Design a protein around this ligand. Structure first.
Ligand SMILES: OC[C@H]1O[C@@H](O)[C@H](O)[C@@H](O)[C@@H]1O
Ligand SMILES: OC[C@H]1O[C@@H](O)[C@H](O)[C@@H](O)[C@@H]1O
Ligand SMILES: OC[C@H]1O[C@@H](O)[C@H](O)[C@@H](O)[C@@H]1O
Ligand SMILES: OC[C@H]1O[C@@H](O)[C@H](O)[C@@H](O)[C@@H]1O
Ligand SMILES: [Mn+2]
Ligand SMILES: [Mn+2]
Lengths: 458, 456
């Protein structure tokens, strides 16, 4: 028997809440200050501003400027002895406004229209920073002390693969290790307005593959006797993957951590009802590689995948060109799951190609990110799940991992604290797109959930 | 017994007829004639028309289709005289981009005992050398002992567009001939004159796959099939590791080589398959390694080739997409018995049967194949005459691996066909600094003159 406020009620609460309003003006200022890692613009400016903001309400603040993007930490202390610690991880850099992106109003001007707030960073990730601070300060309106120690860590290079995050966390692990729970930088409601509460990221390894079959393109009259670069490469790739998408590389699945019973039960309960709908959404013309719902979800969340991002050889254009191309190349990737490390995955692929008779395929490592997940059974995570249900009428969607890539493995490796992601995004927030937005009611609801999480530590 | 190269060059220098047509060649080369660019076609056809008319030939320039068809007939007075036909083309490929040209491609240049220019080998030089041979003969005899017809088309480099129609129209003036001499021929790397009697064929076509409306984030790569995987799977289902084509009903249509054809291969085919590996710097094993297996595959079997394939992202860095589209440019090299349209339809059926109905196929070009076992007496005569002019001997092959209109010409004319000419293994047809050895050019003249004399 749970009752929930209406969207109209949430918006009025938001309008009447002096603390939420104070930090909404702070959000306006933050959005206005462009902070992009890849344009080197405004990182120190935003990191210092955040420093002042948190100092004002009594946090002990440290701004480490050792690497390109300053690393901001703000610790709020509880007077309770044997108090636990809560960590909020967030980032203050955003992607550029840019491209063929359509903006109704200036991307760096926080704009409110039709019950949504618009601006570069309102969802990813600055809005999450002002909402979580709002929550703490609201709790502080009605209490003399915090029931739990609270640490905010804000990096400035999340959109450029969290450059040097590993070096900041190693440097400051002593103050962070041992916390009860770490809440991730963002989260969203899904298409059914269920709050997604997730516990992992998949990883990836990307690499170039190249073949040189001869010193020059040869006349195609020789194609019956002379092997060409594209045939060799097609044969090589075809050797590494079954028609159902299973990867044919020895040693690879042996390293994969299989999902436990809880993880499989979570998928059953919370995974999309009809994942076969991707066919409609993208106008697929070929059948899915895995069609039954659970086979599909399990492949999607818990299996790796060998992907061709591009392949090219010989002649493109109008007309013909009677050649056996000397060179062929491809841009490949393997999506990873826990157990699989980028360099090692590539070495197993080198070995299998050599064993298959394709030693002339050259491989060149380009990028890697490690994967991470949990079965969402840590009691600190269970607490979050039960509290969230009191705030979202459509309920929650609990997932061991999302299919996105991110720094979760880096963070857990340094800090070893249980991690959970939830936030104030909507399925159509357009992160990284034009008119990035957050629903005003969703933003206020995240404040209330975070304040309730703090109260749960009393 | 055989003249030296130095003697040949001197003979060439002192021969007023050869020198006259060598200046004619200079002019032909200077006039760019490329079918694909529709440049110079009427200009070169008209100029040739006049060159032949001047020496008393009965000339017809048919301008019905894009490239004018030129015919020049020289009559013998002998009443039961046979007829000899020369087929040649006056169009060339362009000079081009990546190609290295020491001097202007459209300026005949002589260096180190070679002549250089676009068309000196393929095919303008063959035209002037053959008219030289006829006219040289006429310096020493009262009349031709055989009727001689020159047929010159201007679309050979573009698959002989409308040749078939011109031959249908003029077949009454041409059918009944004793022998037809093909457009060009070369000496092989061992300086043996190649004498051949066939062209392989070709069917080229685009293959395309659309797998979705849009490029999808590659995180879906374990559940959504992409266009490039589907296409690689389709292409691989059609070709065995050893190059054999896996298409039902294809090999059934292949005409097997007879005993003479195989014996010719064995005698005159390359001595060593592995030389190809050395020449091209091959980094992969040959698809057929034993000599006779290699040779039979090269001249007498079809082959499925990828000229190009592309999909998704090329460029700096990565792009986390499953591409929605992939395409390829394919061809099947053909042998007698295989027709372009039928071959492509058999590939359509196999792909559907194999589960690849979504690969789209678009026919783009086709040429039928042709060959003979080189036993026609009119052809044997050429093989014997040639042994008197080339100290390294001759190389007799039923077919070259190149493509050409032999099938179209035979279908209209039904005259025994033989290819021999003035190129060298390094003439670089279709390439930069295309060239003919001066001595080789004059030797061709003398061999063609002797061919005429053999009809007395
Ligand atoms: O049960 C063993 C492990 O299985 C993994 O798949 C889960 O992500 C872990 O949280 C769990 O500890
Ligand atoms: O008290 C708040 C929460 O703190 C976590 O450390 C405990 O594991 C939960 O059981 C508890 O509900
Ligand atoms: O023996 C039958 C036929 O075999 C074919 O392979 C040859 O090209 C023909 O010249 C011959 O007439
Ligand atoms: O007379 C020249 C040649 O004409 C051909 O028609 C005959 O078949 C040959 O035997 C002869 O040598
Ligand atoms: Mn983010
Ligand atoms: Mn030619």
């Amino acid at each position: 028997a749970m009752v929930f406020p209406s969207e109209q009620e949430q918006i009025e609460k938001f309008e009447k809440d002096h603390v939420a309003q104070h930090y909404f003006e702070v959000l306006r200022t933050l959005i206005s200050k462009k902070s992009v890692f890849a344009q080197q613009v405004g990182l120190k400016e935003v990191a210092n501003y955040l420093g002042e903001i948190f100092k004002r309400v009594g946090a002990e603040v440290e701004i480490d400027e050792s690497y390109t993007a300053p690393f901001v930490m703000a610790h709020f202390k509880s007077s309770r002895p044997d108090a636990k610690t809560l960590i909020f991880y967030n980032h203050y850099d955003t992607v550029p406004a840019d491209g063929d992106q359509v903006w109704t109003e200036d991307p760096f001007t926080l704009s409110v229209r039709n019950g949504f707030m618009y601006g570069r960073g309102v969802d990813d990730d600055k809005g999450h920073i002002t909402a979580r601070l709002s929550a703490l300060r609201k709790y502080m309106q009605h209490h003399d002390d915090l029931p739990v120690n609270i640490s905010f860590i804000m990096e400035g290079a999340e959109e450029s693969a969290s450059t040097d995050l590993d070096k900041y966390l190693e440097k400051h692990a002593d103050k962070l290790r041992g916390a009860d729970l770490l809440v991730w930088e963002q989260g969203t409601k899904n298409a059914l307005e269920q709050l997604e509460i997730s516990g992992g990221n998949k990883g990836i390894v990307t690499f170039d593959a190249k073949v040189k079959s001869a010193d020059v393109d040869i006349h195609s009259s020789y194609g019956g006797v002379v092997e060409s670069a594209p045939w060799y490469l097609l044969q090589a790739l075809q050797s590494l993957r079954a028609a159902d998408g299973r990867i044919l590389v020895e040693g690879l699945y042996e390293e994969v951590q299989e999902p436990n019973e809880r993880e499989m039960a979570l998928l059953e309960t919370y995974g999309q009802r009809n994942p076969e709908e991707v066919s409609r959404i993208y106008g697929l013309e070929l059948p899915l590689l895995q069609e039954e719902r659970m086979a599909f979800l399990k492949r999607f969340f818990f299996d790796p995948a060998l992907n061709i991002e591009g392949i090219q050889s010989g002649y493109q254009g109008q007309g013909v060109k009677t050649i056996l191309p000397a060179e062929a190349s491809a841009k490949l990737e393997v999506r990873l799951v826990p157990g699989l490390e980028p360099h090692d995955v590539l070495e197993k692929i080198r070995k299998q190609l050599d064993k298959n008779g394709f030693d002339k395929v050259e491989l060149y490592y380009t990028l890697g990110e490690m994967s991470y997940r949990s079965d969402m059974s840590a009691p600190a995570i269970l607490n979050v799940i039960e509290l969230a249900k009191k705030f979202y009428p459509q309920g929650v969607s609990v997932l061991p991992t999302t299919a996105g890539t991110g720094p979760m493995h880096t963070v857990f490796d340094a800090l070893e604290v249980p991690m959970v992601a939830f936030g104030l995004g909507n399925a159509n927030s357009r992160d990284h797109g034009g008119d990035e937005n957050v629903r005003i009611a969703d933003y206020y609801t995240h404040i209330e959930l975070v304040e309730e999480l703090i109260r749960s530590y009393e």
